[PDB]
C-alpha cells in the first residue's frame, strides 16, 4: 500500500567483559533486507533479501563503514546516558533507535521518523517538522540541547527527505515482484471436539503479506469479540505471516458461525464456514 | 580546528616532501586542495574515513595517507615545477562559526635548482622634501628585491614597535623577469607618517622582511652565503632637513 | 557538479553596495553551500552555510545572502562596503555526507577603494638609499577613479594602486611605486603609460 523504509538500531552494554554490542536491521515495509552485527569476528553488512544482492561491493563497503562508526559512537552515547541518570557500571543498558521514511502519493516524503529509547522507554524523538526534538525527561533534554547546538535535525532532515526516499524508491523498483505484491491469505476452518457437546472452530489465515490482517468470528451476524481466542500475528519463517482465530461452539451449531477475513490482497469480502 | 605543517617550503625538482594535516574535532572527512591564481581551490584527494582515500579533480603527481582519524598526509613523490602552489587542508562540519575548517595553508615552490634561491635585498627610501612641503605628510618606501621564492613577510617597525597604521604593502610580489620560470621577485611597501613625525631625529623607522628559504638539512657548497630562512632589514632615522 | 563565479574582479568605492554572484549545478536533491572570505593575509574565514532546504534571505550585519533554488544561485551582497571587505570571496557546494566532495568556485576579487575627499595627485622622487643603488618614483594622493597601468619597458617596474590608512588622522590615500636603475628613468615619464589627472603636481 503506502510504502516505508525503517532501520532499527540496538546498542547494548554489558557489565561483563566485552565492548558494547551494536545491531542494525533494515526493513522495506514488512521485509527485512539487511543486517549488521558488531559481535561477528570481522563485522560486515549482510543481505537478507534476494533483490538487495544485486548491489555492488561499493554499496556494502559504504554500509559497513556507516555501521562501524555508529558502533563506536553508541559506545560513547551509552556512557553519556549512564552519566545523565547517575547509573553505575554494574547494570546492562540499551539504546534503541528507530528511523525512516514513508512514501507519499507523489513519490516524495510523506513523513519522516527518528525516535530513540533508553532501557525500553521513550527518550528523544524528531518532530514531524524535522527541525525540532521532543524529549521524554530531563536527561533527554541534555541530549536535546547538545543536538540543537550541533544542528543534528538538519542532518536527519537531509536524509529523511533525500536519500531515504530515493533509495526506498530504488528498492521498490528492484524488488517490485515481491515488495509491490500483496499475497492473499490461504484460509480454512478446522473443527476440534473440546468436550462431549462443544467444539473449537479455528479460522486459519496462512502465507499472507503484508502482516496487517483482520480475522473476526460472527454468530448469526453478531460479533463474538469477547469469546474469540485470537493469537498475535506470527512470521512463518519464509517472509509470510500467519494468524488464527478460535471460538468454542455448541456441537451441531457450527453452521451458525462465520469467519470474516480482511486483507489488502483480498479485493472482495471473504466469509468462511466449517466445511465437512 | 585544522593545523598544517610546514607553512613554507622550497623543493628541488625530483625531491620528495610530505605535507601534514591534523584535525582534533573527530571529523570523518578530510580534504586536500591546491590554490592556483584563477583556478580557485581544486580538490587533490579526500578521505571519507580512516583507511579510505579517494581521488579529487587533480590527483596527478600526488599520494595521500590517512593513518588515523586525526591526520591526513599529502605527499609529492617526484616534485615538478607545476606543483608550485598554495595547499589547503579542509575538514568541514556544521559549526563553521565556532571552528576553523581550513588550515593556514602551505606555500610550496618547486624550482629546477636550489641555487635559484636568493634572500631579499632590502632598502628604505626617505620621503621627498617636495611631498612634505606640499601635503604636510611623509611617505617612506621600502623595497625588497632579488628574492626567490616569493616566500616573504614584510612589516614596519617604528621605535621598536610594529605598526599597521599608515602602511601599504603590495598584494603579491612582482616578477623581475616575467619571461623566466625561475624569475626572482620584488615587493614594495609604503609607510606614511605626518611631516613632524618624520622630522623628529629621535624617531626610528625599520622595514623588516622575513624570508623563508633553505633549512639546516639542505646541502650548500657555493661561494655565496647559504640562502637560509632569515630577516633582512633596512632602517632610517627622522630628519629635520 | 559545478560552482561558477563568473565575476573576476569588482571595484567599488566605500559605502557602495556590492553583489557577488554564485551559480551552481547539482545532481543531489540535498546539499549545502558555503561562502568563504580570503583576506590578503591568505587565510580562509567562514561567512555562511546554507542548506538546500533553508530560507531565501538572511542578514548578518552588512552581509546578506539570497538563496534561490529555482535559479540555482546564492548571491552574496555587502551593503555599505568598507576597505576591510577587500578580499577574494569563494562560493562552495557539497553534498551532506562523508563520501561527498566540497567543490569550490573560481573566486571573485573585491577591491574597496577609499572616497578621496581632497584629491591632490602628484609624482615625487624619493631620496635613495646611500647604501644601495636605486631611484624611486611615488605616484600618490590621487582619486580612486584613476587607474595605474603597467610599464611598456621590461626594466621599469610599476606596482598597482595601494590603499594607505592613517588611523589617528582619519585619512586614506592611494599610491603606486615605480622604479628603474636605467639612465632614462625620470619621474616625469615614469607613469606615462597610465592615464593620469590633468593637474598632477610635478615638482622639479
Amino acid at each position: 500500500g503506502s510504502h516505508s523504509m525503517r532501520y532499527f538500531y540496538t546498542a547494548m552494554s554489558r557489565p561483563g567483559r566485552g565492548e558494547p554490542r551494536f545491531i542494525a536491521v533494515g526493513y522495506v515495509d514488512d521485509t527485512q533486507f539487511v543486517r549488521f552485527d558488531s559481535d561477528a569476528a570481522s563485522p560486515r553488512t549482510e543481505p537478507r533479501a534476494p533483490w538487495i544482492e544485486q548491489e555492488g561491493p561499493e554499496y556494502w563497503d559504504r554500509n559497513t563503514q556507516i555501521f562501524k562508526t555508529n558502533t563506536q559512537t553508541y559506545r560513547e552515547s551509552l556512557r553519556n546516558l549512564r552519566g545523565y541518570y547517575n547509573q553505575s557500571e554494574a547494570g546492562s543498558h540499551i539504546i534503541q533507535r528507530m528511523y525512516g521514511c514513508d512514501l507519499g502519493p507523489d513519490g516524495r516524503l510523506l513523513r519522516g521518523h527518528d525516535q530513540s529509547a533508553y532501557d525500553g522507554k521513550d527518550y528523544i524523538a524528531l518532530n514531524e517538522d524535522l527541525s525540532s526534538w521532543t524529549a521524554a525527561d530531563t536527561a533527554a533534554q541534555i541530549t536535546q540541547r547538545k543536538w540543537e547546538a550541533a544542528r543534528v535535525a538538519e542532518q536527519r532532515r537531509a536524509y529523511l527527505e533525500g536519500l531515504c526516499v530515493e533509495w526506498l524508491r530504488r528498492y521498490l523498483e528492484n524488488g517490485k515482484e515481491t515488495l509491490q505484491r500483496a499475497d492473499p491469505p490461504k484460509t480454512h476452518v478446522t473443527h476440534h471436539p473440546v468436550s462431549d457437546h462443544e467444539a473449537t472452530l479455528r479460522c486459519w489465515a496462512l502465507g499472507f503479506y503484508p502482516a496487517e490482517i483482520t480475522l473476526t468470528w460472527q454468530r448469526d451476524g453478531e460479533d463474538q469479540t469477547q469469546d474469540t481466542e485470537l493469537v498475535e500475528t506470527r512470521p512463518a519463517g519464509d517472509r509470510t505471516f500467519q494468524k488464527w482465530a478460535a471460538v468454542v461452539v455448541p456441537s451441531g451449531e457450527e453452521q451458525r458461525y462465520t469467519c470474516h477475513v480482511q486483507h489488502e490482497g483480498l479485493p472482495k469480502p471473504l466469509t468462511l464456514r466449517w466445511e465437512p | 580546528g585544522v593545523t598544517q605543517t610546514p607553512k613554507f617550503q622550497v623543493l628541488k625538482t625530483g625531491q620528495s616532501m610530505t605535507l601534514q594535516c591534523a584535525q582534533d574535532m573527530n571529523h570523518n572527512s578530510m580534504y586536500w586542495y591546491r590554490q592556483d591564481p584563477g583556478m580557485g581551490l581544486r580538490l587533490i584527494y579526500y578521505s571519507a574515513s580512516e583507511g579510505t582515500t579517494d581521488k579529487g579533480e587533480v590527483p596527478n603527481g600526488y599520494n595521500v595517507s590517512r593513518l588515523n582519524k586525526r591526520e591526513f598526509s599529502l605527499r609529492l613523490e617526484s616534485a615538478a615545477p607545476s606543483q608550485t602552489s598554495v595547499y589547503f587542508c579542509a575538514s568541514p562540519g556544521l559549526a563553521g562559526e565556532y571552528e576553523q575548517y581550513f588550515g593556514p595553508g602551505t606555500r610550496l615552490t618547486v624550482t629546477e635548482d636550489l641555487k635559484n634561491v636568493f634572500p631579499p635585498e632590502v632598502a628604505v627610501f626617505e620621503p621627498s622634501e617636495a611631498e612634505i612641503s606640499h601635503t604636510q605628510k611623509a611617505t617612506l618606501v621600502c623595497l625588497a628585491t632579488g628574492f626567490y621564492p616569493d616566500h616573504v613577510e614584510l612589516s614596519w617597525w617604528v621605535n621598536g614597535k610594529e605598526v599597521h597604521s599608515g602602511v601599504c604593502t603590495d598584494p603579491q610580489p612582482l616578477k623581475e623577469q616575467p619571461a623566466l620560470n625561475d624569475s626572482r621577485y620584488a615587493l614594495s611597501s609604503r609607510l606614511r607618517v605626518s611631516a613632524t613625525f618624520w622630522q623628529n631625529p629621535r624617531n626610528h623607522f625599520r622595514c623588516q622582511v622575513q624570508f623563508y628559504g633553505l633549512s639546516e638539512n639542505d646541502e650548500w657548497t657555493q661561494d655565496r652565503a647559504k640562502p637560509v630562512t632569515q630577516i633582512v632589514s633596512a632602517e632610517a632615522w627622522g630628519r629635520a632637513d | 557538479q559545478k560552482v561558477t563565479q563568473a565575476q573576476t574582479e569588482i571595484s567599488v568605492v566605500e559605502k557602495e553596495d556590492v553583489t557577488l554572484d554564485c551559480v551552481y549545478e547539482t545532481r543531489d536533491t540535498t546539499y549545502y553551500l558555503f561562502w568563504y572570505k580570503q583576506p590578503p593575509s591568505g587565510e580562509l574565514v567562514f561567512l555562511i552555510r546554507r542548506n538546500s532546504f533553508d530560507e531565501q534571505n538572511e542578514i548578518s550585519g552588512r552581509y546578506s545572502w539570497n538563496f534561490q533554488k529555482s535559479t540555482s544561485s546564492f548571491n552574496f551582497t555587502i551593503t555599505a562596503s568598507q576597505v576591510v571587505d577587500s578580499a577574494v570571496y569563494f562560493c562552495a557546494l557539497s553534498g551532506f555526507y562523508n563520501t561527498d566532495k566540497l567543490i569550490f568556485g573560481t573566486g571573485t576579487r573585491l577591491q574597496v577603494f577609499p572616497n578621496i575627499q581632497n584629491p591632490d595627485p602628484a609624482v615625487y622622487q624619493l631620496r635613495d638609499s646611500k647604501s644601495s643603488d636605486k631611484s624611486v618614483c611615488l605616484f600618490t594622493d590621487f582619486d580612486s577613479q584613476t587607474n595605474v597601468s603597467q610599464s611598456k619597458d621590461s626594466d621599469v617596474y610599476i606596482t598597482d594602486k595601494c590603499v594607505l590608512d592613517m588611523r589617528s588622522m582619519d585619512f586614506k590615500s592611494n599610491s603606486a611605486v615605480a622604479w628603474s636603475n636605467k639612465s632614462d628613468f625620470a619621474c616625469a615619464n615614469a607613469f606615462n603609460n597610465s592615464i593620469i589627472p590633468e593637474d598632477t603636481f610635478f615638482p622639479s
Binding site: 533494515g26 530513540s116 550541533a150 536524509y159 | 570523518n28 556544521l94 | -
Partner: peptide, 13 residues
C-alpha cells in the same frame, strides 16, 4: 540505505 556519516563529527547522545 541507512543514514550515512556526516562530513564532520557524528554526534553522540
Amino acid at each position: 540505505l541507512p543514514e550515512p556519516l556526516p562530513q564532520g563529527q557524528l554526534t553522540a547522545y
